[PDB]
Amino acid sequence: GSHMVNFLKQIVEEDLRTGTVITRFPPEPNGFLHLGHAKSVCLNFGLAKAFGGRCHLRFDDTNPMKEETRYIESIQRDVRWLGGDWGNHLYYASDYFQQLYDWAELLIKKGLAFVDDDSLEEIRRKRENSPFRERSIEENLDLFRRMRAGEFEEGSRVLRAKIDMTHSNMNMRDPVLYRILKKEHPRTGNQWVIYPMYDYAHGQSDSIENITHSICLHRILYDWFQEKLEITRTRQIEFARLNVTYTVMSKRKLLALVTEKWVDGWDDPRLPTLSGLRRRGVPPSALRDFCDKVGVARRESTIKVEVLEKCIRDALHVVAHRRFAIQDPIAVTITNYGDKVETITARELHFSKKLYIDRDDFMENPPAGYRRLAPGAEVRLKHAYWIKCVDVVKDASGLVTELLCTYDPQTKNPDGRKVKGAIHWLSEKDAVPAEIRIFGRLFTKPNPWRENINKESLKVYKGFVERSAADSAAFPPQSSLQFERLGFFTPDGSTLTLPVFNLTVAL
């Protein structure tokens, strides 16, 4: 004793007294969200919900971003999909452009900011002092003012906080506050020609917004700005970026993967974007569950994809619908059945003279001790009878193209006895042409855009699907099918002709 249990309640009281809570999810509107953002989303929305508070949805559009509105839509989509609830209200860092500017003037007035004439080269080198650090307040302030006025040109001058070049912040060696960029803003138009850098704008945005718990790496700087400003303080909580084996999430590597056509679009199922995961057929709950099983941690680790796959598989398993599919068809004729077409309940499922099995389930010269079909051998057809293969017919190339099989009335079982293996199958009467896409891990090794990329990450088959599986009203573009003894599949869609299905996950 002297402790705990569902003393979630007590610590709820410590935070409650040590302060309603207000978090923010603040993506930049310059790119589709990925799995990492899911971790952030669960944390921020999660935390506000737990305390009956509010989580602001903020776009960090602190400089001109090309297709800002596209990303605003996409982000709202993905956050709703994940299950986050912001207000009815959208927040924008660009809304703070003036206040930010005013506060920057305050820094120069306190002798805590100066204008550096040295280049981006000279700066990324000398990080010792700028040659301009000891500029007077009057001169600094005037120079900044003219920077805003648009008198000097891109990169010629820059405004920097005046901290310690020595002190290993590490990013506390005179961080850049304002860069001069002569380009128009989606939202601010032509009103600004200098813009604030992420570090300068981030905590001040938090402050303006009365964010109580900011969840995001170093917060000496964040605290520094708030301290010296001296404005509403906001508690900065920092955790470790998400890392998953066989997976990359770097802006650069991802952009390469798309642009270089390694994958097909940002919503490709092999990609760890929320769009791609949604299209792969992963359900949002699997993701929420995954982000819970990853856990908080200040120290940087790496979760094995098997944890992800288990989350999505466990989720799919609860809500999938059993349906039959053949990816690499091979024909079976039942030699002792004749015509007539018997119904089976196991959804409409028939049994007839003409079936299909999957090629991987037959073998002409089987290893010793081999479940599954082979000449002379017998298998159980799931939800049906046992077939024995006697005779095979091959094409001109010697390729097996039809199996001749007797069956045996005595369905789900053994009358003898016997048994062995069971396989999936499809009656011709029930089959409809389909494109079955089998997706692998994007990469081949756990710790790689470093092209050690799975060249076999996508194999496409022209096969068959049980007719109700292509119902489209019954199974719309991200519903859950379990194609028996084949995997968890969703019908393909898009997250902005043959029926197409994606392998969402094995087993």
Q: What is the CATH number of the domain that holds 359?
A: 2.40.240.10
Give residue 354's identity as a one-letter amino acid code.
Answer: K
Beta strands in 230-339 (DSSP E): 235-237, 321-323, 325-326, 329-334
Contact status, residue 274 vs residue 326, Cβ threshold 8 Å: no
Whether residue 2 lies inside any domain: the answer is no
Beta-bridge partner residues of 462? 435
| Residue 344 near residue 351 (C-beta atoms within 8 A) | yes
Q: Examine residue 463 and state whether it is found in any structural domain, yes or no.
A: yes
CA distance 142 to 144: 5
Whether residues 440 and 397 fall in one domain: no
Domain contains 1: no
Q: Are residues 83 and 103 in the same domain?
A: no
Q: What share of the chain is helix, strand, coil (3-state, %, to 5)?
A: 30, 25, 45
- Structural biology method used: X-ray
Phi, psi of 389 (to 5 degrees): -85, 120
Does residue 303 share a domain with residue 381?
no
Q: Collect all residues with Cβ–Cβ distance below 8 Å to 442 and sequence separation of at least 6.
A: 246, 247, 248, 257, 262, 263, 270, 271, 453, 454, 457
123 and 189, same domain (yes or no): yes
Are 105 and 151 found together in one domain? yes
Torsion of CA 202, 203, 209, 215, to 10 degrees: 90
In a domain, 12, yes or no: no
Instruction: Indicate if 76 and 34 belong to the same structural domain.
Output: yes
271 and 223 within one domain: no
Amino acid type, 279: R
Q: For the chain, what is the domain count?
A: 5
Is residue 7 in a domain?
no
Do the domain assignments include residue 207?
yes
Which residues have a catalytic role annotated?
A: 28, 241, 251
Question: Alpha-carbon distance 233 to 207, whole Å?
Answer: 6
User: What's the domain range around 343?
Assistant: 328-431
Resolution limit, Å: 2.8
Domain stops at, among 411, 431, 451 = 431
Looking at the DSSP assignment, which residues form a beta bridge with residue 501?
A: 436, 491
Return the half-sphere exposure (C-beta side, CA atoms, 13 A cut-off) of residue 320. 24
Q: Are residues 229 and 311 in the same domain?
A: no
Residue that is last in its domain, among 407, 431, 455: 431
Q: How far is CA 192 from CA 71, 101, 114, 208, in A?
A: 22, 10, 20, 20
Of 331, 359, 316, which is closest to residue 461 (Cα–Cα)? 359
Residues 162 and 214 in one domain: no
Residues 148, 36: one domain?
Answer: no
Domain end among 195, 223, 253: 195
Residues in the chain: 507
